[PDB]
Amino acid sequence: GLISARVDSHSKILYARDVDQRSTTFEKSLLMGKEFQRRAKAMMLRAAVLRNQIHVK
């Protein structure tokens, strides 16, 4: 991540990539939402198993 660039080895040219702030914001927000949903649905199951006092003896 020191240099934001892309190498084209056909013509041997170092281009500069431009991060699309809108697209990267959207994808980061969607990934965060997916992670949130997974974490919450795991926490609900953990609450269910702790309410039942389920554990391995």
Binding site: T25, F26, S29, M32, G33, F36, A40, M43, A47, L50, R51
Partner: protein
């Protein structure tokens, strides 16, 4: 309240458009002596629609829709975070186990 505020203005626009349409219908057959100027202005008004039906507008509109949708998704996530915080707090004060 917001939709009633929009309703109050759409009602006025509908009233004006209905009055113009009634004038055109009356001047059509025999009711009111028609003015060429007013009829031509009504034709121009009809030719003014659709308003900005270009492909460039249809992209900016969906840009705005997706921006507001992302904001709504983040607000929903925040609200669910608050609700799960409250649920976790009550679960901890009821099932408190050390």
């Amino acid at each position: 309240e917001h939709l009633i505020a929009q309703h109050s203005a759409i009602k006025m626009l509908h009233s004006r458009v209905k009055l113009i349409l009634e004038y055109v219908k009356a001047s059509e057959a025999g009711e009111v002596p028609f003015n060429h100027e007013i009829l031509r202005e009504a034709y121009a008004l009809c030719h003014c629609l659709p308003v900005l039906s270009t492909d460039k507008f249809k992209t900016d509109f969906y840009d705005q829709c997706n921006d507001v949708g992302l904001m709504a998704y983040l607000g929903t996530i925040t609200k669910t975070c608050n609700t799960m915080n409250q649920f976790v707090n009550k679960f901890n004060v009821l099932y408190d186990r050390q």
